[PDB]
Design a protein around this motif. Structure first.
Motif, short mmCIF file in Angstrom:
data_model
loop_
_atom_site.label_atom_id
_atom_site.label_comp_id
_atom_site.label_asym_id
_atom_site.label_seq_id
_atom_site.Cartn_x
_atom_site.Cartn_y
_atom_site.Cartn_z
N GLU E 23 42.12 13.82 7.87
CA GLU E 23 42.77 14.77 8.76
C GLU E 23 43.01 14.13 10.13
OE1 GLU E 23 41.43 16.46 11.53
OE2 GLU E 23 39.48 15.45 11.51
N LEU E 24 44.10 14.53 10.77
CA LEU E 24 44.56 13.87 11.98
C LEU E 24 43.60 14.07 13.15
CD1 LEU E 24 47.18 14.40 10.13
CD2 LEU E 24 48.45 14.11 12.26
N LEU E 25 43.49 13.04 13.99
CA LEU E 25 42.50 13.00 15.06
C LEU E 25 43.10 13.20 16.45
CD1 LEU E 25 41.26 11.29 12.63
CD2 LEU E 25 39.84 10.20 14.29
N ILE E 26 44.40 12.98 16.62
CA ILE E 26 45.07 13.18 17.90
C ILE E 26 45.74 14.55 17.91
CG2 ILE E 26 47.21 12.05 17.17
CD1 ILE E 26 47.34 10.86 20.05
N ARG E 27 45.71 15.21 19.07
CA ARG E 27 46.26 16.55 19.18
C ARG E 27 47.78 16.55 19.03
NH1 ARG E 27 42.84 17.35 17.47
NH2 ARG E 27 40.66 17.29 18.19
N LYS E 28 48.29 17.54 18.29
CA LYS E 28 49.71 17.61 17.98
C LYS E 28 50.58 17.87 19.21
CE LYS E 28 49.52 18.93 13.23
NZ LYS E 28 49.63 19.94 12.15
N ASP F 2 52.98 13.80 33.72
CA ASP F 2 51.53 13.81 33.55
C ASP F 2 51.13 13.86 32.08
OD1 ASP F 2 48.76 14.14 33.89
OD2 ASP F 2 48.92 15.99 35.04
N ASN F 3 52.10 13.97 31.16
CA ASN F 3 51.76 14.29 29.77
C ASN F 3 50.99 13.17 29.09
OD1 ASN F 3 52.98 17.00 28.97
ND2 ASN F 3 54.73 16.01 29.98
N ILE F 4 50.96 11.96 29.67
CA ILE F 4 50.18 10.89 29.08
C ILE F 4 48.70 11.27 29.04
CG2 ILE F 4 49.88 9.66 31.26
CD1 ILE F 4 50.57 7.91 27.90
N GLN F 5 48.28 12.18 29.93
CA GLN F 5 46.90 12.65 29.97
C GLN F 5 46.59 13.61 28.83
OE1 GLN F 5 45.81 10.09 32.58
NE2 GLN F 5 44.32 11.67 32.02
N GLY F 6 47.60 14.06 28.08
CA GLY F 6 47.33 14.89 26.92
C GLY F 6 46.72 14.15 25.74
N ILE F 7 46.89 12.83 25.67
CA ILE F 7 46.10 12.02 24.75
C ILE F 7 44.78 11.75 25.45
CG2 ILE F 7 45.96 9.87 23.45
CD1 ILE F 7 49.32 11.27 24.44
N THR F 8 43.82 12.65 25.24
CA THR F 8 42.62 12.72 26.04
C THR F 8 41.62 11.64 25.65
OG1 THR F 8 41.53 14.27 24.55
CG2 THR F 8 42.99 15.19 26.22
N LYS F 9 40.64 11.43 26.53
CA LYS F 9 39.56 10.48 26.27
C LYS F 9 38.91 10.67 24.91
CE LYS F 9 34.97 9.22 28.06
NZ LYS F 9 34.15 9.87 26.99
N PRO F 10 38.55 11.89 24.48
CA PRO F 10 37.95 12.02 23.15
C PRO F 10 38.92 11.66 22.04
CG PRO F 10 37.45 13.93 24.52
CD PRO F 10 38.56 13.19 25.18
N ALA F 11 40.23 11.83 22.25
CA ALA F 11 41.18 11.44 21.21
C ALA F 11 41.19 9.93 21.03
CB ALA F 11 42.58 11.97 21.55
#
Lengths: 106, 97, 82, 95, 98, 80, 109, 95
Positions: E23-28, F2-11
């Motif tokens: 299952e995918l790990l990055i938010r959609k 700012d949307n580059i911050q949506g790929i967050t640290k936990p991701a």
DNA sequence: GGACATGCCCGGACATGCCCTATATCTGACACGTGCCTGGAGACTAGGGAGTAATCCCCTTGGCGGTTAAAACGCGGGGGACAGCGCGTACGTGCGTTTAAGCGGTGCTAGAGCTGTCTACGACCAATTGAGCGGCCTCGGCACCGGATTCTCAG
DNA sequence: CTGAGAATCCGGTGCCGAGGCCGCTCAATTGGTCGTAGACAGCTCTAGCACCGCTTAAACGCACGTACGCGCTGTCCCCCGCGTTTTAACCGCCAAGGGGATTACTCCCTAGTCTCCAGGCACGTGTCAGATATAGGGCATGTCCGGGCATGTCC
């Protein structure tokens, strides 16, 4: 009198030859009249760019004739040409005189 | 008598062979190796001169590039001497190993 | 039948190749791995070249066969035909 | 008397256009021929695939142009498209 | 005192967990916003199919996982464990992306 | 923006975990973001080029599949 | 008129000889195509499908699953040296990766 | 009723039932199988076309297909595929 | 305590030979003239694939919220990254030797390359139908949730 | 050894989508005809292979010095794990619009063929820039000599 499409276009690569090579390459059942003109024109442009840079490198080397070494220098020194030819090996080209900094003496 | 410091002649040889274009692998042993390997693929093969020169140009370019990458990986590890593990890492990361 | 031709790829030749690649110092243990790698390259390239030769109903490997083999292996070589 | 296929005379004319003082060796000429043939094959193949994917049976200038944009880097693509368009427009007017 | 695992045990547990599944790990949605943002810098008012964004996301995660595999191998080669930017740069340089 | 911050640290941590790393430096996250962004620039460029050649206004899944294929990594599961 | 029977049935294959032949004709590969080329191609494609499906089924039963999912296909591809070589540059969607931990990362006593 | 969209689904299912009578297939997995088969198709057909062109051959035969399979497929896989293709082609020719 | 003589270390002049610059010879490889004939150019015909207009519906875009798992932040800490030092050992560097690498000449025949014939082989079109694809049902393999069981770990 | 956190399996219940069935449909099949091209023979002619001879640069083995990979120790810092607060991801649901694809009509653009011509390619030939060789200026770099410092010893 017969006058060729390259002559009407003011270009150096032969429209007829590129057209025939497209027609016989088993690429498509029809080929438009402008497609070989465009392709030949792009080839002139790229050849002119490579020969320009290789000539420059030859003059920097006090050479009047371009050699494979100069071609390698031209392709590898130009960022966009090196990208375009990223997976291409030129014979008798050698490599760029590049030395890592950490390997230099202190 | 006189003796050069470790490193100066190595660098001189690097500059020398990177400035010029002559082949560095001997013709006859390379041809012999190619022919030896070929017997186990197809019998009594004949090879064109330009074919052996093609294999040699390709081989020398491949090894020089692999040694470039190996050197970059070794220096990355704050080393200068290349190790077998360096070759294996370079080939694994290139995706052939 | 040629036998033990792998020993013809001498230590100084591999050293020279490493010098052209920018290597300053070479471990004594480097040589067998390099030889193995070289051998691997040859078995793949020659296999393709000979395959083309046999398809063409020939017994002599041509320069074009080798250049084409290299191209289809992504290591396209310039200077022996296009 | 076995006729072959090379761009030697055209490469020499372009070279004389850009540098009418420089020659070229046989090995270098072979490298230029290999290069031009390789580019040709790459561009023609991408244009062919482009046309097939789009259910097009004719090779026209738009697929060639798009293929050039895909294969050539930024400044190379822009300059090539400009030269190709000017040349094709001049030919079309000249008929 | 409350229970606390030593550094690494929980790391290995998440490694096992996420390597077992698909299952995918990055938010959609944040990825989707990024893709549309980056895209207007090539063509304005562009639209995206849902399956197009999901394809891009699958490709991105596969690419990143492979890059992180290679980075880890390079780190281990240097008798290290923690990956750093120079490791990423070496991995991409040797791959031929730089 | 700012949307580059949506790929967050936990991701980035989760993607790295699937890549098999046990420890992640603080300097890793921006590097990963840059790499991801560059990849996207190249992919989206090719995809949009294909979309425009087809005289369309919406990038399709098939456009992406062709872009990925030509980039040198074939993606299975979205057609073709 | 004789009863119609397909070339795939004549060849003992499941993949459609007619369709593969049509795709070869219309793929802009050549003006002429032999009768045996699509038979051979169908045979190779069927063989590769049977081996990949065999391995994926094995993995599925090892996981006590009766339905093949992409995960099983990815496992089957990566667990076979020759399939992994053939598909070295292919990413399977929803496939994940092979479970594998480098020895240096394991704890020590 | 949409346009005619071709796929290998029924053939993949028939082969699956031959090799695994009691095993099914998901839609995502079937899509992956279709992508795989189409990719192999493209690789083999393209290499065979190129092989034929290189040798000034205007007809697609079984020798170029077999040689292309041998180039693309690994060793034992190539031997098994070649064996199957030859038996199948000779049996077809018997009809 | 004062005088004497040298051990030892560091700075500078310098031997060694490396890099760089200049020039004579030639020579074979690069640049230019020729014939022709086959590929390229001008022209007429056909037809079919491409350009363009109208529809729709489905596929995308846009909006509210909740609520909960994920994201962001605070903080202890300990273990891994990083700096410093010993060593010894395997590798850089120099020299004699031989060993084979490299070049020149000739064999000639296996094998690459060009051409003649035609018959099997494949392109191409009419009629057909049966395999192949879109739409609907359902039930079973799979997904979600709760609980006991087991795995593993760190004090 | 043992309590606690987490993964796992078993069971129950739901659920939704793939496999089967049916109707439609369009291209694979069968048949025949005709262009065509490549398999096989045959001739030509190119260089690949082998051999011999000679010269000379490189490999190799050894001797010797030495630089850093690895191991060890110390330091520190900053990311992992946990707890608390937040917040938007995602599912759910609903409106709306716009353009991808479809179908139809038209049209014009290039394959095909014919006829004629011109320029590009072996062949040949002239000729000139770099490979090869030798000699002279100038300077980097490790090496050895001279001068100065310092501490030991005798009267």
């Amino acid at each position: 009198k017969a006058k060729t499409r390259s002559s009407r276009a003011g270009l150096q690569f032969p429209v007829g030859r590129v057209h025939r090579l497209l027609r016989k390459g088993n690429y498509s059942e029809r080929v438009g009249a402008g497609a070989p003109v465009y392709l030949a024109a792009v080839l002139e442009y790229l050849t002119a760019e490579i020969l320009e840079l290789a000539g420059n490198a030859a003059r920097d080397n006090k050479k009047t004739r371009i050699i494979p070494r100069h071609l390698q220098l031209a392709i590898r020194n130009d960022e966009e040409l090196n990208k375009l030819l990223g997976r291409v090996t030129i014979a008798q080209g050698g490599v760029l005189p590049n030395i890592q900094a950490v390997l230099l003496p202190k | 008598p006189h003796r050069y410091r470790p490193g100066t002649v190595a660098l001189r040889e690097i500059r020398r062979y990177q400035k010029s274009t002559e082949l560095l692998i001997r013709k006859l042993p390379f041809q012999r190796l190619v022919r030896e390997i070929a017997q186990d693929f197809k019998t009594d093969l004949r090879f064109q001169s330009s074919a052996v020169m093609a294999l040699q140009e390709a081989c020398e370019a491949y090894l020089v590039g692999l040694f470039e990458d190996t050197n970059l990986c070794a220096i990355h590890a704050k080393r200068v001497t290349i190790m077998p593990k360096d070759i294996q890492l370079a080939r694994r990361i290139r995706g052939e190993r | 039948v040629l036998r033990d031709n792998i020993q013809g790829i001498t230590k100084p030749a591999i050293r020279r190749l490493a010098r052209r690649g920018g290597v300053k110092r070479i471990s004594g243990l480097i040589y067998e791995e390099t030889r193995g790698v070289l051998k691997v390259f040859l078995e793949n390239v020659i296999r393709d070249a000979v395959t083309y030769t046999e398809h063409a109903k020939r017994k002599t490997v041509t320069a074009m066969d080798v250049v084409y083999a290299l191209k289809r292996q992504g290591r396209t070589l310039y200077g022996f035909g296009g | 008397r076995s006729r072959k296929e090379s761009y030697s005379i055209y490469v020499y004319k372009v070279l004389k256009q850009v540098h009418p003082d420089t020659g070229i060796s046989s090995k270098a000429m072979g490298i230029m021929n290999s290069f031009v043939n390789d580019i040709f094959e790459r561009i023609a193949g991408e244009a062919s695939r482009l046309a097939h994917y789009n259910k097009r049976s004719t090779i026209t200038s738009r697929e060639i142009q798009t293929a050039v944009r895909l294969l050539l880097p930024g400044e190379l693509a822009k300059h090539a498209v400009s030269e190709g368009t000017k040349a094709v427009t001049k030919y079309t007017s000249a008929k």
